Amino acid sequence: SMHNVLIVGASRGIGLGLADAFLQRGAQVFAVARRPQGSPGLQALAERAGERLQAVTGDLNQHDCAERIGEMLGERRIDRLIVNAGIYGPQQQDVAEIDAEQTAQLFLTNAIAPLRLARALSGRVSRGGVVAFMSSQMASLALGLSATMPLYGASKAALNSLVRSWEGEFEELPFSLLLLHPGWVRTEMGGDSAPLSVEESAAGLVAAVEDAAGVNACRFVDYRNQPLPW
Amino acid sequence: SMHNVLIVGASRGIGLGLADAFLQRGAQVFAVARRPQGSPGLQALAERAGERLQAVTGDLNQHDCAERIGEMLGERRIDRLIVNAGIYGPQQQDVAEIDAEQTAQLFLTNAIAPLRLARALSGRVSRGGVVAFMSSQMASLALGLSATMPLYGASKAALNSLVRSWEGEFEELPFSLLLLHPGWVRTEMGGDSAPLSVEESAAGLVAAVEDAAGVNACRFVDYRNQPLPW
Ligand SMILES: NC(=O)c1ccc[n+]([C@@H]2O[C@H](COP(=O)([O-])OP(=O)(O)OC[C@H]3O[C@@H](n4cnc5c(N)ncnc54)[C@H](OP(=O)(O)O)[C@@H]3O)[C@@H](O)[C@H]2O)c1
Ligand SMILES: NC(=O)c1cccnc1
Ligand code: NA
Fold this sequence. Notes:
2 copies of one chain form a homodimer.
Chain A: E1 4-8, H1 13-24, E2 28-33, H2 40-49, E3 53-57, H3 65-73, E4 78-83, H4 100-121, E5 125-134, H5 150-167, E6 176-181, H6 198-212, E7 218-222
Parallel strand pairs in A: 1-2, 1-4, 2-3, 4-5, 5-6, 6-7
The complex binds NADP nicotinamide-adenine-dinucleotide phosphate, nicotinamide and sodium ion.
PDB class: oxidoreductase
Keywords: short chain dehydrogenase, reductase, oxidoreductase
Assembly: dimeric
């Protein structure tokens, strides 16, 4: 079943790493970015993979994102749908200072928009496919690591909650629903202290995604496919 | 020996029931509401309890809320602080339709503002006291029951996250941190429409709050003081 892979937010970082790693496995990759032409990484993947990498212009916060993606896919089904795009929220991560506009941006971008998009595309997802949302270990209540970055963590707890609630709408899950912790990865957000490379993270995430295909389960797992507690 | 109990959001519903229940125990209650004079319930409690119920105008979303509360308390320490923020969010509970203003209102009211207020008042809380936030069963990832009300549920998962993040800022808790599920006073089952009275819910929550005094723990509990999973 691993034919058509859609990565939402693929210009750089983990998302670009995912596009690369799925291409290396022989997938047909639809790589959505806000400004694809401005991504040297995606341009380098297009050079290498040719027509197996299709760059798609799109924006997770735009309500026409699913329609653009569908117009582009035509009748093609999505085997693996990965929502990767995200933000951090205010740099000081201070619940005492975040304002209304920041709050709306943070919870729309990191929690609501992923569900809106995935839901809008869900009828095009192959039965037995995988819909995966990049989450974080900061979303875990039990781990309690969200002190490190409380606003980001809360946004990802909200994401996890909305994915569990979507699961609850189905009498029988038609695809898997994954919440993925990529590890702490050297990206613009992750910074120089992050212990994992994008390449290591993405390799593992690809395996976790593939391990859920055909299982129709909801899992919160890391890049080693190890379960994280809620 | 009369404890000082501050209830933020006390004009109706469980907030009003908590004020009533604490008054019946002999506490000094400060009952904060947006428009106290327009609450017949609070007016009836003021009439019955006299000075032991102080109905205070205040709004968790206003940037002077903590300041006004403090000016009003003077040097009185807060033995029990109960934040009964809560709005449902958009009635359709639809990620495809929620806009920026609604998103800000939902996550500020239900998650961010409660923490902002509690944190600002923290130094006035009695050591060995209790700070409690009204959460919900719908916040629980493990239960996963929030399909009917996904946005409300996600807003309360965000609350639980932010409370856990605050917990992690302390080497040892100076007071308990509770997340409360009040139960369902009304259900969508016609043959089981009213399984719990507000007065029983409030009485139960008071017992749960009192059970945490002096424990200095973080607990997610219902009105029977049963633990809910995260
Ligand atoms: N790095 C880590 O250590 C780490 C740890 C835990 C979880 N995560 C999660 O893993 C995901 C990827 O993390 P990351 O560090 O590689 O990158 P990120 O900073 O979270 O996201 C950056 C990528 O998202 C795109 N993006 C942002 N907003 C977008 C929008 N409205 N529409 C379309 N694309 C948008 C960006 O494209 P532009 O080039 O156009 O900006 C970029 O490709 C995120 O969900 C993040 O929360 C990362
Ligand atoms: N989940 C993580 O460890 C994380 C999230 C965002 C930035 N850095 C690390
Ligand atoms: Na990056």
